[PDB]
RNA sequence: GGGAUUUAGCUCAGUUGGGAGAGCGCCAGAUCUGGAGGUCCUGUGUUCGAUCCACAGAAUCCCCAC
RNA sequence: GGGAUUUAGCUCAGUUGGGAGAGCGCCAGAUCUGGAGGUCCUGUGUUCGAUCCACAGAAUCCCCAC
């Protein structure tokens, strides 16, 4: 039956991304008593999970960039001989395990991973591109939020065609300050190394000075 | 984008294995007893029926034994997609089993894929009750040796060059009879769905009529599956 | 460099279907001696090809199904382990080679490869719709034939929008008469086992008596 | 449809590894020089050219030894796609190398793919480089015992267990000089594209031009990759 | 298989070789003068020189088909 | 992420539970009477019973974005 395990033995090339994102969490966090649309305790939850991951799993990430619901690892060292079954489950594994214990859960979740096949002067880009991920549902989902405050059809079709500036607008003439918003709601979280550091005041990656902060993250 | 391995998909049938990574050094330092627990094996089994229950998935069933789990599967979510299955898979088992045991630091379990034919779906759960057997025989072994002073390394090529009449042999000069232990630990356990008959009134026929209710079960005395009732009882769970 | 194979212990399972696909033969064949749109010398070796796979190669296919350029072997044995790159690469190269000596080419051919993954109660499907193939490029390309003897776009542009039966209609009236061309140009050849067979008139696999033709052809 | 590797892509730098089917027994057997031919060897340099020449793709070289072949590709068809390009490079070479030696049976090349980084490009070449050393010693070994009768196991256990050493002392005792043997016996042959510059005729500017013109070049006598000389000259082969 | 299309962020022009333009949108100062913006889909050839020519491909569209 | 759509070969109707219809196209005899054709996108639940209800997904479309 080792002949009928088709994907055990394939493969990746460093350096590799690891991409964990939680699964139905919208429907699997519900319940508890979560914040909308942002809740301090459970992107805290994350970095420890994340921090976790760094400390305890023994696979040596580089480091760790999340931002709710996802986890975005480094590796140039590949684990379990860059087997892509084995990384992705074990490494899922390990955070749903850990977000468990940070949460306290009494029912349990699961998260999905991915590879990412990265060239290393691919790396910057790649972050780059999540935080932009991390800028787009920190307004919309604020604006999702400050109305429906509207059913779900109807807050969404207001919202329809509208630009992030008049998203802003909106919001404000709502009572809602995006621009002074904490800044973990905006870029995101960085977890690095030695002991280990959560900074939840990082820069934008393509800027300065948040090129060199990637870079020297990156080494 | 560079997310290579994300379109990778399996035609069921297919069996899902997850195996607990580091679990025999995890279990040893949170003081399980050795080199048996049943309540670890409890944990297994309410996992698995957890998984079977709440995942999302269908299972036909689950084989578990020691640190792994075997799930049957003729129908996949994410289209079959590898990678999401046996993360989302391994991570919600991880989950459930750190609910159950209510652990303060984390595990993780490894999963993969095994395609099969329709036909070979017994073999492979054959095989991996001989695993079962296997490890049953070791386990023990090793224990026994490491009790009276062995290395670890010593006691391993041991248990590899020693046949396991000779295991049996030292295992029973020393108090330990392998025959008299729990069916538990040499066959696993099984859950799955058991069929009841049940009926209700039907208002438009104005009838009573029969029907079916499928109630998770926890199996801890299973056949030998290639013995003469073991081949029904799975063909009666492969169905 | 052998974590680098990242490829090499990718598997299928039994049963699968190998179908190999001349690259490029349209412009890599002119310049012989070919008729239009049908060459009986050219089938003759792809057939001559397939049946030289099932003596020489030792790979055991239960049988082959061609017509040109393409081939379709049966595998419950799967070569190399079940390998996809071993057994597409070594088996496209083998008719590479194979088909270059029954044509007694000056310059290279190739042949691609590819895998299906049947489930063995999909098998006569398979060879059904591959026979369907068969059937279409027989009627266009006869239809292409007979217009253009134009221009590539101006043939092209007369056969749009048009159905299989007019084109018989128009075929007829050009002088083309399909229901009596040779039963291998509109359903191809089956080549199998022992002594090695090739069957230049074979049924349609879906219908009397092609069902049971196919069936025996699996065991 | 049920075509589940169609899909599946790599992302260049990427070296394709193409190797001989059988080829020790049916080279012996169609009459060609044991343990080496030079026509054969030639065979395979100039099927590696008529790759570079006329198979639609840019390998940016080719090293060849024995009855395998290396391409280096940082541009590839058919997206990438494994299949695809493992099939079509492992036929194109079958069919050239069947034409070189006008072959009236058919033969076959296996081939893969070896994904790389940049940095890593050089290690690579290294690491087949030294298994044309271990080929050229083994070959040679190989032929002096069954010469002088020892059975093919053994003559195969022996080259095993034996250190390499000792393989050259019975190697020389016996009549052969490895040192005194043909490079290309013992490195391979790299063919590649040399650069040369030419000038030409500028009627716009109305003045004269220089440019460059790559011509397909053999190799024969190749340096040791990571030698003095080895490390830029590989470097460049590269570029 | 067969026919096409691919050029600025968007909609398109432009020829068969000396390396590129309009309108919308964009920044700097609802209309004018100021701007930025390009891989002419990719690689390799040919050529003194390629957006244009030759070869092998890629993406999207249409026909045949089911 | 957010909003949708999915039922005959094609274009669509139909409700919140007793298991399904029109028109085009199709076969049998340019218009009438004769027909065939269904996995109500999948799996699992709930229910005596699911196209409809609950859960997890799939495919396609739109918004945000770049
Ligand atoms: N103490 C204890 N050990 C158990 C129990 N059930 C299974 N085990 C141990 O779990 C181990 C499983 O073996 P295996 O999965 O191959 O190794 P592992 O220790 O998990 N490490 P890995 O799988 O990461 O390589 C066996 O050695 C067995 O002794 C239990 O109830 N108690
Ligand atoms: N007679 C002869 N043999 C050669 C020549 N060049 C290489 N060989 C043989 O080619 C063989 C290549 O080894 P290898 O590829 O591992 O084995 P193989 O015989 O091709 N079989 P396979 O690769 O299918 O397992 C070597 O044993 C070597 O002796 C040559 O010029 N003449
Ligand atoms: N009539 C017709 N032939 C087609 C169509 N698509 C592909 N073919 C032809 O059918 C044969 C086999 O197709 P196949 O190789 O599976 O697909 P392909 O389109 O070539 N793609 P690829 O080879 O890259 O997978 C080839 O001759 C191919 O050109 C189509 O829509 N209509
Ligand atoms: N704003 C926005 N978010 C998107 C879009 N597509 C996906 N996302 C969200 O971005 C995050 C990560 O996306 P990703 O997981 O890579 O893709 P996905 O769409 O979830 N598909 P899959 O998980 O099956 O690969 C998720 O929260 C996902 O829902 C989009 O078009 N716009
Ligand atoms: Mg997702
Ligand atoms: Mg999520
Ligand atoms: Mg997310
Ligand atoms: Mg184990
Ligand atoms: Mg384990
Ligand atoms: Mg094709
Ligand atoms: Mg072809
Ligand atoms: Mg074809
Ligand atoms: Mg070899
Ligand atoms: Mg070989």
Redesign the interface.
């Given at each position: 039956?080792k002949?009928?395990?088709?994907?055990?033995?394939?493969?990746?090339?460093?350096p590799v991304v690891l991409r964990?994102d939680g699964?139905?969490f919208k429907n699997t966090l519900s319940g508890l008593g979560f914040e909308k649309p942002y809740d301090k305790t459970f992107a805290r939850a994350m970095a420890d999970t994340a921090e976790?991951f760094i400390k305890?799993?023994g696979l040596s990430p580089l480091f760790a960039y999340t931002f709710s619901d996802e986890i975005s690892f480094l590796f140039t060292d590949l684990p379990f001989?860059?087997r892509?079954?084995?990384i992705?489950?074990?490494?899922?594994?390990?955070?749903?395990?850990?977000?468990?214990?940070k949460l306290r859960?009494?029912?349990?979740?699961?998260?999905?991973?991915?590879?990412?096949?990265?060239?290393?002067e691919?790396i910057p880009e790649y972050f780059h591109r999540r935080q932009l991920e991390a800028w787009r549902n920190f307004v919309a989902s604020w604006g999702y939020y400050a109305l429906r405050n509207m059913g779900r059809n109807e807050a969404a079709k207001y919202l329809k065609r509208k630009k992030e500036s008049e998203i802003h607008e909106m919001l404000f003439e709502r009572g809602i300050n995006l621009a002074t918003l904490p800044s973990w709601q905006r870029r995101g979280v960085i977890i690095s190394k030695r002991k280990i550091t959560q900074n939840w005041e990082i820069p934008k990656f393509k800027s300065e000075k948040g090129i060199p902060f990637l870079e020297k993250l990156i080494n």
């Open positions: 039956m002949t009928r395990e088709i994907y055990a033995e394939m493969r990746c090339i460093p964990a699964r139905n976790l305890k799993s001989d860059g892509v079954e084995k992705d489950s074990v490494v899922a594994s390990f955070l749903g395990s850990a977000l468990t214990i859960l009494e029912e349990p979740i699961a998260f999905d991973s991915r590879l990412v096949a990265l060239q290393k691919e």
